[PDB]
Every structure is written in C-alpha cells, then in structure tokens.
A and B are shown apart, each in its own frame.
With several copies, the nearest count.
Chain A
C-alpha cells in the first residue's frame, strides 16, 4: 500500500509459525458511504493440517 505521508510503499508482513495458502481475497466497499479507495480487504488463509504426532484422537 502507499501512504502519501511517508511517500513510501509499505507492506503488511505475515507473522505466524506456519505457512499457509490464500483462499479468498475479498474487497470491502460495503455499508460505506463512498470509501471507493478500497481501504478494507479480508484475506483468508488455508493452513493444511496433516495428522501428526501429538494430535489428539
């Protein structure tokens, strides 16, 4: 993304213990009065979970 105040292209880093896959990216303009600049985005992560030592059964 880009904030004019910083004149910089900034990024939101992913902070987690495990890799994932992006399932959906949803662009939210709804319930807004105008908001056309698309300031809200919802991103879904798909984390595969293989049965593993320590999993409860």
Chain B
C-alpha cells in the first residue's frame, strides 16, 4: 500500500489515480510521500 501523509493532519492515506490530491481527514492539499520498508546499502562513512 503506497502511503501519503497529510501535511497538516498526519492522517495516513492511500491515494489513487482517481482521487483528489487532498487529505481526506483535514482537507489540506499537500501530502508527503511516505517512507517505506525499503533496503538501502551504506558505507559507514
């Protein structure tokens, strides 16, 4: 499930190509693309 957080309500949601770019819990129009459990390698320097 892709995730997008409301910039002003913190409410998690799962946007679709068929929905309005808006927080369904607040009504804000700014959404942060959520981080997920995804592997990244790092040189410890």
Q: What is the 8 Å Cβ interface bit string for chain A, positions 17-55, against chain B (1 contact, 0 not)? A: 000000011111111101110100000000000000000
Number of A interface residues in the complex (CB < 8 A): 13
> Looking across the interface, which residue of chain A has its beta carbon closest to that of B31?
A27
Q: Tell me whether A27 and B22 are in contact (CB under 8 A).
A: no
Q: Tell me whether A36 and B30 are in contact (CB under 8 A).
A: no
Q: Tell me whether B32 and A25 are in contact (CB under 8 A).
A: yes
**Residues of B1-36 whose CB lies within 8 A of A:** 4, 7, 15, 19-22, 28-33
Q: Tell me whether B30 and A30 are in contact (CB under 8 A).
A: yes
Q: Tell me whether B20 and A26 are in contact (CB under 8 A).
A: no
Question: Which residues of B are interface residues toward A (Cβ below 8 A)?
Answer: 4, 7, 15, 19-22, 28-33
Smallest CB-CB A-B distances: 8 pairs: A29-B21, A30-B29, A25-B33, A29-B29, A27-B31, A36-B20, A38-B21, A30-B30
Question: Which residues of A are interface residues toward B (Cβ below 8 A)?
Answer: 24-32, 34-36, 38
